[PDB]
Amino acid sequence: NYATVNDLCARYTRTRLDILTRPKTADGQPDDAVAEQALADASAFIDGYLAARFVLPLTVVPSLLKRQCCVVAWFYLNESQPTEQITATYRDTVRWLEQVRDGKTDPGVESRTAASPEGEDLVQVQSDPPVFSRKQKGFI
Amino acid sequence: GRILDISGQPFDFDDEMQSRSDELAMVMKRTQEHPSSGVTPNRAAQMLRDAERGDLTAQADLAFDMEEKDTHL
Numbered sequence: 001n002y003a004t005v006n007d008l009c010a011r012y013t014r015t016r017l018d019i020l021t022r023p024k025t026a027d028g029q030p031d032d033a034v035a036e037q038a039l040a041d042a043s044a045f046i047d048g049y050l051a052a053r054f055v056l057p058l059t060v061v062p063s064l065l066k067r068q069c070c071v072v073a074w075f076y077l078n079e080s081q082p083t084e085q086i087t088a089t090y091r092d093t094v095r096w097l098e099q100v101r102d103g104k105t106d107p108g109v110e111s112r113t114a115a116s117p118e119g120e121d122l123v124q125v126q127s128d129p130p131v132f133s134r135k136q137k138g139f140i
Numbered sequence: 141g142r143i144l145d146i147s148g149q150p151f152d153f154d155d156e157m158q159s160r161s162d163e164l165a166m167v168m169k170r171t172q173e174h175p176s177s178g179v180t181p182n183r184a185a186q187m188l189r190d191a192e193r194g195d196l197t198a199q200a201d202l203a204f205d206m207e208e209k210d211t212h213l
Binding site: 135136137138139 | 180
């Protein structure tokens with residue numbers, strides 16, 4: 001997963017996270033595996049939206065992707081009855097992921113070293129070996 | 141017996157053919173390179189310059205291929 005539960009419980013108040021999680025567990029006591037599973041599902045969502053033009057086991061993780069995983073995990077964790085703002089922000093992050101997949105916006109870099117994640121060649125052409133090109137310094 | 145050539149240098153004349161000298165048996169039998177397969181002007185210039193420097197093998201093979209390939213030629 002892109003973001004750990006210790007970050008989702010920091011961006012979103014831990015008490016509200018416990019309130020959301022405690023029903024979903026089998027026993028009925030505050031649990032941590034539910035949040036990790038939701039974060040894994042959100043990371044899978046982002047991975048699917050990024051694999052279009054990136055090598056998906058990201059060499060360097062864009063620093064905004066932690067936020068983009070936390071928001072989607074929060075929406076996935078409020079599926080029974082979400083606030084209007086949660087839905088609006090989830091639609092905004094889906095729009096951002098669609099723009100990233102299309103090519104309108106790059107995901108960003110790692111804020112530590114400003115390195116952008118690599119990916120496979122979106123465009124690739126092959127032609128026959130070049131003959132009579134200007135690089136052939138013979139003749140002329 | 142010491143026959144002189146046109147340039148007036150005496151020598152001994154031998155009936156044995158120079159190729160059939162039991163020393164050039166592995167250099168008189170060469171399988172041709174056929175260098176005219178996929179020639180690029182750069183490589184043609186390279187073989188021409190090699191021939192100019194003294195190694196005439198590539199030029200001769202290229203000429204043979206040009207003779208047998210280009211019908212008008």
